[PDB]
Amino acid sequence: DVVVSRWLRVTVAGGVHISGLHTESAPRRQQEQQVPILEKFCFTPHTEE
Amino acid sequence: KRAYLQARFPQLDSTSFANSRDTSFEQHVLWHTGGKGVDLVLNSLAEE
């Protein structure tokens, strides 16, 4: 069982006891991100001029 | 000492005292202040 106390900045579970954990934002920038194919569903007459 | 201080200063409540011989006072202060902490800290202890 785990308990997190943001007020005391302590996380306790089992036989472990973490205090004063500090986390810093990562850039979160990943290369080669997915590139979706964008299209429009449009009517099209068979014959045009 | 706690009893003597309580006698000297009636304003002090049972929640305004901690233990000076260990680092347990930190949790007490943080809890009773809602995690905000204190403003002035007249520190006289040492090391940890």
Curated annotation (Swiss-Prot), chain B:
The modification N6-acetyllysine is found at residue 1. Ubiquitous. Prominent expression in brain, lung, liver and mammary gland. In adipocytes, S-nitrosylation of Fatty acid synthase occurs under physiological conditions and gradually increases during adipogenesis. The modification N6-(pyridoxal phosphate)lysine is found at residue 1. It is found in: Cytoplasm; Melanosome. Fatty acid synthetase is a multifunctional enzyme that catalyzes the de novo biosynthesis of long-chain saturated fatty acids starting from acetyl-CoA and malonyl-CoA in the presence of NADPH. This multifunctional protein contains 7 catalytic activities and a site for the binding of the prosthetic group 4'-phosphopantetheine of the acyl carrier protein ([ACP]) domain. The relatively low beta-ketoacyl synthase activity may be attributable to the low 4'-phosphopantetheine content of the protein. Homodimer which is arranged in a head to tail fashion. Interacts with CEACAM1; this interaction is insulin and phosphorylation-dependent; reduces fatty-acid synthase activity. This is Fatty acid synthase. It comes from Homo sapiens (Human). The gene is FASN.
